[PDB]
Amino acid sequence: XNXXSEXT
């Protein structure tokens, strides 16, 4: 959602 942008 975060952890990246797509990610967690």
Side-chain angles (χ1 to χ4, degrees):
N2 49 71
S5 299
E6 46 176 64
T8 33

Short mmCIF file of all heavy atoms in Angstrom, two decimals:
data_model
loop_
_atom_site.label_atom_id
_atom_site.label_comp_id
_atom_site.label_asym_id
_atom_site.label_seq_id
_atom_site.Cartn_x
_atom_site.Cartn_y
_atom_site.Cartn_z
N UNK A 1 0.90 -1.14 0.00
CA UNK A 1 0.00 0.00 0.00
C UNK A 1 1.56 1.97 0.00
O UNK A 1 1.30 3.03 0.57
CB UNK A 1 -1.34 -0.37 -0.69
N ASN A 2 2.76 1.39 0.07
CA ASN A 2 3.88 1.88 0.80
C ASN A 2 4.78 0.74 0.46
O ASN A 2 4.43 -0.08 -0.40
CB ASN A 2 3.72 2.08 2.34
CG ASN A 2 3.10 0.86 3.03
OD1 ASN A 2 3.77 -0.18 3.15
ND2 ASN A 2 1.81 0.98 3.45
N UNK A 3 5.96 0.66 1.11
CA UNK A 3 6.95 -0.37 0.91
C UNK A 3 7.48 -0.32 -0.50
O UNK A 3 7.89 -1.33 -1.06
CB UNK A 3 8.15 -0.26 1.88
N UNK A 4 7.43 0.87 -1.12
CA UNK A 4 7.41 0.98 -2.53
C UNK A 4 6.27 1.93 -2.59
O UNK A 4 6.22 2.85 -1.78
CB UNK A 4 8.65 1.63 -3.18
N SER A 5 5.34 1.67 -3.50
CA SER A 5 4.32 2.59 -3.93
C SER A 5 3.19 1.68 -4.25
O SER A 5 2.11 1.77 -3.67
CB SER A 5 4.73 3.40 -5.19
OG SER A 5 5.89 4.18 -4.92
N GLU A 6 3.46 0.69 -5.13
CA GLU A 6 2.79 -0.58 -5.08
C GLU A 6 3.80 -1.36 -4.29
O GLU A 6 4.98 -1.01 -4.29
CB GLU A 6 2.52 -1.23 -6.46
CG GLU A 6 3.72 -1.21 -7.43
CD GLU A 6 3.34 -1.97 -8.71
OE1 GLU A 6 2.41 -1.51 -9.41
OE2 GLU A 6 3.99 -3.01 -8.99
N UNK A 7 3.35 -2.35 -3.51
CA UNK A 7 4.10 -2.80 -2.38
C UNK A 7 2.94 -2.93 -1.45
O UNK A 7 1.80 -3.05 -1.92
CB UNK A 7 4.86 -4.13 -2.60
N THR A 8 3.17 -2.80 -0.14
CA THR A 8 2.25 -2.95 0.95
C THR A 8 1.32 -1.77 1.12
O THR A 8 0.92 -1.44 2.23
CB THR A 8 3.12 -3.16 2.19
OG1 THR A 8 4.34 -2.42 2.07
CG2 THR A 8 3.47 -4.66 2.27
#
